[PDB]
Design an enzyme around this catalytic site. Structure first.
Site, PDB file in Angstrom:
ATOM      1  N   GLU A   1      -4.067 -10.737  -0.190  1.00  0.00           N
ATOM      2  CA  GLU A   1      -5.047 -10.069   0.440  1.00  0.00           C
ATOM      3  C   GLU A   1      -6.137 -11.055   0.170  1.00  0.00           C
ATOM      4  OE1 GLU A   1      -4.464  -6.912   2.997  1.00  0.00           O
ATOM      5  OE2 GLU A   1      -2.355  -6.884   2.102  1.00  0.00           O
TER       6      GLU A   1
ATOM      7  N   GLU B   1       0.824  -1.282  -0.496  1.00  0.00           N
ATOM      8  CA  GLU B   1      -0.282  -0.060   0.697  1.00  0.00           C
ATOM      9  C   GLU B   1       0.445   1.353  -0.157  1.00  0.00           C
ATOM     10  OE1 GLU B   1      -2.729  -0.875   3.250  1.00  0.00           O
ATOM     11  OE2 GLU B   1      -4.404  -0.136   1.771  1.00  0.00           O
TER      12      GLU B   1
END
Lengths: 978, 173
Positions: free
Chosen positions: B125, B49
């Protein structure tokens, strides 16, 4: 002599794949040989093109060795006069039906002997070249002119031209055409013999335009175009010969070019002295598409240096670019979504003779139902069809007449080099004839012939000769090296069909296979045999979600319409699923997304309406101003908020206020419905003063309330009779129904002689669903404070196994209403039932059926997105769908209220109502054998199975549309006028 | 790599700045230098991220030069940038697209077949296990087994699928 049938019918050219023609002229675009350029520009009829269609003498013979020699010189005495464009099996000579040795054909070869006696005027014979054109002759034929053999032809679906200059005399002449029913070419066209297309005479000058083809090139933004026109002459070359190519928009010339003959240097030996390439610059060309079919007129004049015209030809030109880029098929730089249909050449009542008006009617219907593409099903079409698709706007896939699906290796011929010449003729002559049409955007190598090296060779040939169009081919697994597009037949949205060596993946999975980059367009999907097209919305959801899923062609336009072009109900579904405006609702705002690629919505008006249980409350109309692939937000006025119980529905529709070339004024193109808000009914029925009275004999339960009576048979447990006054209301007792008359998708390819046990109807028959017997288990009758309660329990058993259990309660209160609650349990191991509902035969026949529910047209759980919720009133005949092979039909889903005569049924149910029972529909082979029964058969189902439609040879009803829950509940209130 | 700048408001403000290239390069190169001999390590990840900057591309190319034996993955800037050998979305769904601006989360089936896309898809994820969760897991595994280039994923938070004392959540079953 050498023209006698003994000599001519000795080499058996129809049993030799190495001989497909003799003395046949070359293929080319259609020619009229205009002698004045103004007539070529306006497409006026040419005096040099003379039709020979009309009355011909015809004789029939069992075999080609049975034709008398005298036929070559004089017409037979018993010969029957016919119209030549026709199939001789429309006149009772040999039997045609729908349905071994690759070079050899049966020796009993039915033979049609056509003859024509005609005048040739002197001017044609003085100078120039006179040819005869056969637009189509089924199988193979030998030609004689005035007793002298001319030539031989095959490939039924393409024109055969023969030079008749040396054979024609002054005045009267006789043409003799021997047409064989079978040849070696039949192995590539795997009926209906005869001269089924137009026959013409064409006169060209001594020096003539022998060929010409056009191409369009564009810059990056399509604001500049180069029209390249290659012109080929034949005859004696002279230094004063000139070719002028002029482009016209209407009556305004936009470009022009002139040059002598002699092309650029091609190799060490030079160039073509008989060819000329002219390049024309067109600034800001009007682009061709299906949405806006802009056309130009290209006129090719062969003249001299001083200026006298020798001959003129003309064609329609569409400036458009077709290419595959990054896995997407683009037209003029935009990704296409193919709303296509497969269409055979089948006249309503003339066999394979296709006329102009039928084509125009078909094109109008297709465009009116939101189709933008058509697939020439397995052979090239009449040349007028391509012109009409140029003029009205329809993407066209042009298919070679190669079809060898009967072969057991299935590529036995198409992998054999000895069959390469015959296939190459069928591909090359089609490309040579049809390459100038803007509507033709894709070449197809044929249908169902496996995959051989001949397919690769012909694919490469087309790519070399015409790089402007992609080449597709279904065969050998729909993704071979002989196709630019993955083009499966009847592949499914989500379910794989992993057949050996030719798997039919789900299209979503097919797109993402390792190494796969090509776009996917189904050449055939959504088989429309009988009551079908369930699951169409799934296909179109997949098409809109996935960029490289670019649409497909629905099988059998005619089919989606009946032979008389009367529309199938599923056509409405298709029209809704292929509409060019998508609608989203958010609060009081409607987002309208345009699916047009090129055109602004300049002939579009959005009407909306809000209704409560079919009663309108508010409406309005908003003009649409949506850019191609854009969005428009429409804020709704403050919508009514009624306090009365009911469900609010918002309907929007797009109307075309002005007529177009293909639609009338007021045409509805797109629509959508949403549920707005529901108010639940909490008001109680006012307590009644009377109480229904119950009487109990051993035979029956009788309930009396005023003039109304209900009688339940105690031996069977079913409601047996109803009385209003003294009139019996029922003819057959109201009983549970778990079966339906099987559909074409239920039957599949199961046959009486060859049973397919995976088919739904076979599984139902083996389980005993059609032969299951109801056995009463419990029956109670009680009187409550203000009602009478009847409770019954039934078990359906077959060969000792209980398939269904039905428990029912009947509550008759003081208002005359009869509430029926039904609870059904289904054994998990029996096949899932086609329906769970009630069935009865009403004694009275009424003119109209009224219902608050879904749609005016027949709709089913897996085909109902195009139906709308409203109050519908139809005649009873409108509630029956006349499918050719009778089956379950006419169902209306999502129905809250049904009124028929004095009877009203309320609840949440599906129904069909007709004069035919499910039993009669099952036991009747053709719809003309059906007879109306005494009263009205009503089938009210709590639950109904999906109909399928992905194909018609395997089960295709998705699991979400099967009745697999095991337990089912429904309720219905039956009341009468009062 | 220990690179995580999810608090940044442009979210690639540091990872697109050449003044931060040395600090990121240390965190990538020292990890590769420490762990390159382990057979269990099969994939290098550029971090988590941090948007997508030119530093990500530079470090991706560095790893490919130094250690060509392992693929390099990076979720950031849309999970399919030039700094990853694998399409590695976070919490993309089986059938439903989530078309966010400039970083859409396509359905994985649709993501595989986008024009020009050739890479395998593995979710770094998916199947968030906060509280009573893991509904729809069977849909993910039906998609994994049906599609060859859907090659699995990593369920978020082992510990989580188990409690802190390693007592198993029912969804673990």
């Amino acid at each position: 002599i050498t023209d006698s049938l003994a000599v001519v019918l000795q080499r058996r050219d129809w049993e030799n794949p190495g001989v497909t023609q003799l003395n046949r002229l070359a293929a080319h675009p259609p020619f009229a040989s205009w002698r004045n350029s103004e007539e070529a520009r306006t497409d006026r009829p040419s005096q040099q093109l003379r039709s020979l269609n009309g009355e011909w003498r015809f004789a029939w013979f069992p075999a080609p060795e049975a034709v008398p020699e005298s036929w070559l010189e004089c017409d037979l005495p018993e010969a029957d006069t016919v119209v030549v464009p026709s199939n001789w099996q429309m006149h009772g000579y040999d039997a045609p039906i729908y349905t071994v040795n690759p070079p050899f054909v049966p020796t009993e070869n039915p033979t049609g002997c056509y003859s024509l006696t005609f005048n040739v005027d002197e001017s044609w014979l003085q100078e120039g070249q006179t040819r005869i054109i056969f637009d189509g002759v089924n199988s193979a034929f030998h030609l004689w002119c005035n007793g002298r053999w001319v030539g031989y032809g095959q490939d039924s679906r393409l024109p055969s031209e023969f030079d008749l200059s040396a054979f024609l005399r002054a005045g009267e002449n006789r043409l003799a055409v021997m047409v064989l029913r079978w040849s070696d070419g039949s192995y590539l066209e795997d009926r209906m013999s005869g001269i089924f297309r137009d026959v013409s005479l064409l006169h060209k000058p001594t020096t003539q335009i022998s060929d010409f083809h056009v191409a369009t090139r564009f810059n990056d933004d399509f604001s500049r175009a180069v029209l390249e026109a290659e012109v080929q002459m034949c005859g004696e070359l002279r230094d004063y010969l000139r070719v002028t190519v002029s482009l016209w928009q209407g009556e305004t010339q936009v470009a022009s070019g002139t040059a002598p003959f002699g092309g650029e240097i091609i190799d060490e030996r030079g160039g073509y002295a008989d060819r000329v390439t002219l390049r024309l610059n067109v600034e800001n060309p009007k682009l061709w598409s299906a949405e806006i079919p802009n056309l130009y007129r290209a006129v090719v004049e062969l003249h001299t240096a001083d200026g006298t015209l020798i001959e003129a030809e003309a064609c329609d030109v569409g400036f458009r670019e077709v290419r595959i880029e990054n896995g997407l098929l683009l037209l003029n730089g935009k990704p296409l979504l193919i709303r296509g249909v497969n269409r055979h050449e089948h006249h309503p009542l003339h066999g394979q003779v296709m006329d102009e008006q039928t084509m125009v009617q078909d094109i109008l219907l297709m465009k009116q139902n939101n189709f933008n593409a058509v697939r020439c099903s397995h052979y090239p079409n009449h040349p007028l069809w391509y012109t009409l698709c140029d003029r009205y706007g329809l993407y066209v896939v042009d298919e070679a007449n190669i079809e060898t699906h009967g072969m057991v290796p299935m590529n036995r011929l198409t992998d054999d080099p000895r069959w390469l010449p015959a296939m190459s003729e069928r591909v090359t002559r089609m490309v040579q004839r049809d390459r100038n049409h803007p509507s033709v955007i894709i070449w197809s190598l044929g249908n169902e012939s496996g995959h051989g090296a001949n397919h690769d060779a012909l694919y490469r040939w087309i790519k070399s000769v015409d790089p402007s169009r992609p080449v597709q081919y279904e065969g050998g697994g729909a993704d071979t090296t002989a196709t630019d597009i993955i083009c499966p037949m009847y592949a499914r949205v989500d379910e794989d069909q992993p057949f050996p060596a030719v798997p039919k993946w789900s299209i979503k999975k097919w797109l993402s296979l390792p190494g796969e980059t090509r776009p996917l367009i189904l050449c055939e999907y959504a088989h429309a045999m009988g009551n079908s097209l369930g699951g169409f919305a799934k296909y179109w959801q997949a098409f809109r979600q996935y960029p490289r899923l670019q649409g497909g062609f629905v099988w059998d336009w005619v089919g989606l319409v009946f032979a008389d072009r009367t529309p199938h109900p599923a056509l409405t579904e298709a029209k809704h699923q292929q509409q060019f405006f998508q609608f989203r609702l958010s609060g009081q705002t409607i987002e309208v997304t345009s699916e047009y690629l090129f055109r602004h919505s300049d002939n579009e008006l959005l009407h909306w309406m809000v209704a409560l249980d079919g009663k309108p409350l508010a409406s309005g109309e908003v003009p649409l101003d949506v850019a191609p692939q854009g969005k428009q937000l429409i804020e709704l006025p403050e919508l009514p908020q009624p306090e009365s119980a009911g469900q609010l529905w918002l309907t929007v529709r797009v109307v075309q206020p002005n007529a177009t070339a293909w639609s009338e004024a007021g045409h509805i193109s797109a629509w959508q419905q949403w549920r707005l808000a529901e108010n639940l009914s909490v008001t109680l029925p006012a307590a009644s003063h009377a109480i229904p009275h119950l009487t109990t004999s051993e035979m029956d339960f009788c309930i009396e309330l005023g003039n109304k009576r209900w009688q339940f048979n105690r031996q069977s447990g079913f409601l047996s009779q109803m009385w209003i006054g003294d009139k019996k209301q029922l003819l057959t007792p109201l009983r549970d129904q778990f079966t339906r008359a099987p559909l074409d998708n239920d039957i599949g390819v199961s046959e009486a002689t060859r049973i397919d046990p995976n088919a739904w109807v076979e599984r139902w028959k083996a389980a005993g669903h059609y032969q299951a017997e109801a056995a009463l288990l419990q029956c109670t009758a009680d009187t409550l404070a203000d009602a009478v309660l009847i409770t019954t329990a039934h078990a359906w058993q077959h060969q000792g196994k209980t398939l269904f259990i039905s428990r029912k309660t009947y509550r008759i209160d003081g208002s005359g209403q009869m509430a029926i609650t039904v609870d059904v349990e289904v054994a998990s191991d029996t096949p899932h039932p086609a329906r769970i509902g009630l069935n009865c035969q009403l004694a009275q026949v009424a003119e109209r059926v009224n219902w608050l529910g879904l749609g005016p047209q027949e709709n089913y759980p897996d085909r109902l997105t195009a139906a709308c919720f409203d109050r519908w009133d139809l005649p009873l005949s409108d509630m029956y769908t006349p499918y050719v092979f009778p089956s379950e039909n006419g169902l209306r889903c999502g129905t809250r209220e049904l009124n028929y005569g004095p009877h009203q049924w309320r609840g949440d149910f599906q129904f069909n109502i007709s004069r035919y029972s499910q039993q009669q529909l099952m036991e009747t082979s053709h719809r003309h054998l059906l007879h109306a029964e005494e009263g009205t058969w009503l089938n009210i189902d709590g639950f109904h199975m999906g109909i399928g439609g992905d194909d018609s040879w395997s089960p295709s009803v998705s699991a979400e549309f099967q009745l697999s829950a095991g337990r089912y509940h429904y309720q219905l209130v039956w009341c009468q006028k009062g």
